[PDB]
Design a protein around this ligand. Sequence first.
Ligand SMILES: O=C(O)CCC(=O)C(=O)O
Ligand SMILES: O=C(O)CCC(=O)C(=O)O
Ligand SMILES: [Co+2]
Ligand SMILES: [Co+2]
Lengths: 199, 194
Amino acid sequence: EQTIFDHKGNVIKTEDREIQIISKFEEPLIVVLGNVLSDEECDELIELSKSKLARSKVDVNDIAFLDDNELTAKIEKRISSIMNVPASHGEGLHILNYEVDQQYKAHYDYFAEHSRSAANNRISTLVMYLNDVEEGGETFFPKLNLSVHPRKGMAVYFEYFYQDQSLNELTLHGGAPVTKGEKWIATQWVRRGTYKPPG
Amino acid sequence: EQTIFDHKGNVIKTEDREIQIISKFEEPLIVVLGNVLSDEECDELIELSKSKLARSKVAFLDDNELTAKIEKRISSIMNVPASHGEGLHILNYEVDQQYKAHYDYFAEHSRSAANNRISTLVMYLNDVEEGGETFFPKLNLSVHPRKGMAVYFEYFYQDQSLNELTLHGGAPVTKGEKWIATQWVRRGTYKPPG
Ligand SMILES: O=C(O)CCC(=O)C(=O)O
Ligand SMILES: O=C(O)CCC(=O)C(=O)O
Ligand SMILES: [Co+2]
Ligand SMILES: [Co+2]
């Protein structure tokens, strides 16, 4: 099958940065990427997460995705070149923190048949590692026996838009328990069609 | 099965450097490793290769302090004493050069098979403009060259079909050039005593 990700060679030359292609698992397509985010961009994304939370009072505490800003739009543009899909298909920079012994149990990123979101389903994912994880925290694909270990500024790309649906089901993945330290990530989930309202 | 490479977590701490564990294919074990050699160490290994060729009596490097220090770091990574290593084998690909898919271990009934290879570390000593990936055709997996990085894999399994899955090669270099050092590790001590 043809893939969305359409990049030959060892680097991806985007407008503001050069991405390194580190390794590939060819089908379903899984790619480890280097140099995706600067150290300072990783730190700044974390900070935006903590600030948005620090502004919660009784958004209301009683009732995730960063607010759009110069930094998030610059990063979404860069991601857009990597993923070969316009930024408007992106759900936005979703920030996630794992404390020790937290994990993300294996799942599919594309939506179940019963979600209304399945009207415009997800097609591909980028997981960016915003810090270094003392122990644990690997992104693992249990049906492929593959795992990507977190590393600040690196990312894992994968897609699930294949005609053969058994290939999409191979993209079952999760975030392994953090056994020491903590883990910060940004995820960009990309939809088949435009997702953000115009701007 | 258990594996030779025995390293939990995300870094491997050696005496002089901290290696980064980047990605793992679990079986046969294939590991992408980061921060294995400094840029200075990479360049110096290339120059040693070139200088050794200059003295040509028309290649493994000769033993010196650098190679011993690197081989000691590698032994920590691979969990096997350096005396098992064949030595730093330097290899240069020019454009359109390739290493067709092969096994690193010797045929079971070859002369060298009495002390067969059990694991390989391929260290990328420069950046390759295009091509030159280390590919495992039966596994649909490739590791692209990155200066300072490396790929580890082992083929010491009881189930021989696992070892056969370690078939691999060096894809053609289509732009630039490619330099690598390889450490091939033997089941038993290999270097004469020193
Ligand atoms: O934490 C991880 O490594 C996996 C994250 C993930 O699966 C997701 O964000 O969709
Ligand atoms: O050049 C490569 O990437 C492959 C090296 C290799 O197969 C070996 O040294 O045994
Ligand atoms: Co996910
Ligand atoms: Co080989």
